[PDB]
């Protein structure tokens, strides 16, 4: 959970659903 | 409703320093990363740089990092732009925008302001 | 630079209102994610701040009129305006989410008379 960017927070809640 | 108004604009002379400021409104500024996107006159978009004002996590593209810093003042709900050493290519239009995500995880530029015009003269 | 880089083809083009228009946005490298396609298509009239018409490459913004549909996958995407309407005649604009974020050069759309 290390993302620091909105792409990085971005592709890690898409990928979850 | 949501929006956003810039303000700052002006004709600059290169070598000289200009703030740009995007005042936000319709909704509490925290939660959302804000953009700086600019547009050089009949040209494309450029993203800038992003910034969370909750955390002040903040992310300037490779090309402007050593000139160009975003800030936010949470008091005033306002992001900032820092312009420094401006050259004749940073003559745009210069936008603030705001990323949100959809249930179906999907994020991207919904609302932007009505831009403001930074001119590099001789 | 190690963007994304984004090439909309034509660089202009006009056409009449009825007419249905095509306009294509070519990535350096697959925009796509877990199934989707990260790409989106903003609309710009002149003087105004670009407006979102579809994203994750075929999904229509709310509010946005039906005849404008998206389509496509990986590195090749297409805009289709069928039966163009006065209103939308503006400047067309792709733009990638899978990395940082980039947009096309533009697409100029001009009204024939």
């Known amino acids: 959970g290390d993302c620091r960017s909105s792409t990085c927070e971005g592709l890690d809640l898409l990928r979850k659903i | 409703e949501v929006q956003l108004v810039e303000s700052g604009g002006g004709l600059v002379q290169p070598g000289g320093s200009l703030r740009l400021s995007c005042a936000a409104s319709?909704?509490?500024?925290?939660?959302?990363?804000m953009h700086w996107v600019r547009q050089a006159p009949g040209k494309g978009l450029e993203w800038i740089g992003e910034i969370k004002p909750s955390n002040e996590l903040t992310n300037v593209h490779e090309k402007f990092k050593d000139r160009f810093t975003i800030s936010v003042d949470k008091a005033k709900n306002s992001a900032y732009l820092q312009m420094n050493s401006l050259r004749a290519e940073d003559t745009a239009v210069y936008y603030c925008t705001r990323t949100i995500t959809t249930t179906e995880g999907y994020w991207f530029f919904d609302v932007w302001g009505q831009g403001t015009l930074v001119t590099v003269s001789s | 630079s190690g963007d994304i880089q984004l090439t909309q083809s034509p660089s202009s083009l006009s056409a009449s209102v009825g007419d249905r228009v095509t306009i294509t946005c070519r990535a350096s490298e697959s925009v796509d994610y877990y199934g989707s396609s990260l790409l989106q298509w903003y609309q710009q009239k002149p003087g105004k701040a670009p407006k979102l018409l579809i994203y994750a490459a075929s999904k229509l913004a709310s509010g946005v009129p039906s005849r404008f549909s998206g389509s496509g996958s990986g590195t090749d995407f297409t805009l289709t305006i069928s039966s163009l309407q006065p209103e939308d005649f503006a400047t067309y604009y792709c733009?990638?989410?899978?990395?940082?974020?980039?947009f096309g050069q533009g697409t100029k759309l001009e009204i024939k008379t």
């Open positions: 319709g909704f509490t500024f925290s939660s959302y990363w």
């Open positions: 733009q990638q989410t899978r990395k940082a974020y980039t």
